[PDB]
Amino acid sequence: HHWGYGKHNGPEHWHKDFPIAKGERQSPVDIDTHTAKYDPSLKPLSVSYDQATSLRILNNGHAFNVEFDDSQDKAVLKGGPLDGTYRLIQFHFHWGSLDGQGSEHTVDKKKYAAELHLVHWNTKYGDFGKAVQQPDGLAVLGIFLKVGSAKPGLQKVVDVLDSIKTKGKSADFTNFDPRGLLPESLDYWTYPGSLTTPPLLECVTWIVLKEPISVSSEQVLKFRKLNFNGEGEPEELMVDNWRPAQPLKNRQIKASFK
Numbered sequence: 001h002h003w004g005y006g007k008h009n010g011p012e013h014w015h016k017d018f019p020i021a022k023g024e025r026q027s028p029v030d031i032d033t034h035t036a037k038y039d040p041s042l043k044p045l046s047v048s049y050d051q052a053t054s055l056r057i058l059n060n061g062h063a064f065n066v067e068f069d070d071s072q073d074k075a076v077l078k079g080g081p082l083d084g085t086y087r088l089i090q091f092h093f094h095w096g097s098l099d100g101q102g103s104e105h106t107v108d109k110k111k112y113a114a115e116l117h118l119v120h121w122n123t124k125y126g127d128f129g130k131a132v133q134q135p136d137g138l139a140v141l142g143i144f145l146k147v148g149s150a151k152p153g154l155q156k157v158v159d160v161l162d163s164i165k166t167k168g169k170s171a172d173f174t175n176f177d178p179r180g181l182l183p184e185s186l187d188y189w190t191y192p193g194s195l196t197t198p199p200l201l202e203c204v205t206w207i208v209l210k211e212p213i214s215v216s217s218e219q220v221l222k223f224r225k226l227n228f229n230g231e232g233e234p235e236e237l238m239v240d241n242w243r244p245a246q247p248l249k250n251r252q253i254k255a256s257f258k
């Protein structure tokens with residue numbers, strides 16, 4: 001109820017209210033590329049976002065979420081390591097104060113400038129709340145961001161952030177196409193993990209794409225102008241809203257590519 005990313009409420013403190021923080025399948029993790037094993041058992045990943053229906057964008061004090069209508073299979077993730085159908089509910093990002101940090105997952109200890117999370121729930125459990133009681137309840141598609149050329153499909157998101165500067169603000173965000181945030185390649189790593197924020201629930205099949213997307217310096221600078229605080233409160237820029245890598249423990253990361 002008062003967690004955050006500060007010195008006094010950040011990741012090193014979460015375990016006191018959320019003891020699963022020290023659990024057996026916490027996220028994110030470092031992806032050691034040389035230890036990940038190619039798995040021929042993985043089937044192709046299927047990202048089916050053609051009928052995605054975005055609704056709203058919300059600053060929740062921790063990040064911003066672009067929310068989707070998940071009342072029907074309009075945008076789903078299937079295939080790869082997944083059994084069944086996972087419905088897109090929201091996406092959000094984690095990012096840094098500087099371009100050398102911001103991602104949650106790391107690749108051979110490399111931190112990217114940011115990381116996109118497309119969050120999906122397993123339709124066999126009927127709603128998100130029931131899905132987060134299940135060890136295969138969620139699938140999060142993670143995409144790294146590096147700073148270079150602008151990402152045209154991100155600009156509509158960047159352009160609305162001025163209207164949701166502070167915690168609790170929302171704005172209409174209809175007709176946004178999340179396909180414009182994907183890299184060319186769907187080559188991925190996958191492992192079983194958790195939500196990376198409280199409540200840190202161990203329900204997630206992580207699918208982390210190998211290929212980063214490029215965003216421009218100007219695009220990420222606009223992320224960094226958001227606020228963690230509410231309207232009228234002293235300004236605390238929304239930066240460094242990432243959890244560091246957690247112990248891998250008894251897990252293997254699988255690669256979909258050689």
Ligand SMILES: NCCc1ccc(S(N)(=O)=O)cc1
Binds near residue numbers: 119194197198199
């Ligand atoms: N109410 C739980 C919401 C929640 C959804 C997704 C994530 S993440 N960063 O693991 O994609 C964290 C929390």
Ligand SMILES: [Zn+2]
Binds near residue numbers: 092094117196
């Ligand atoms: Zn996230």
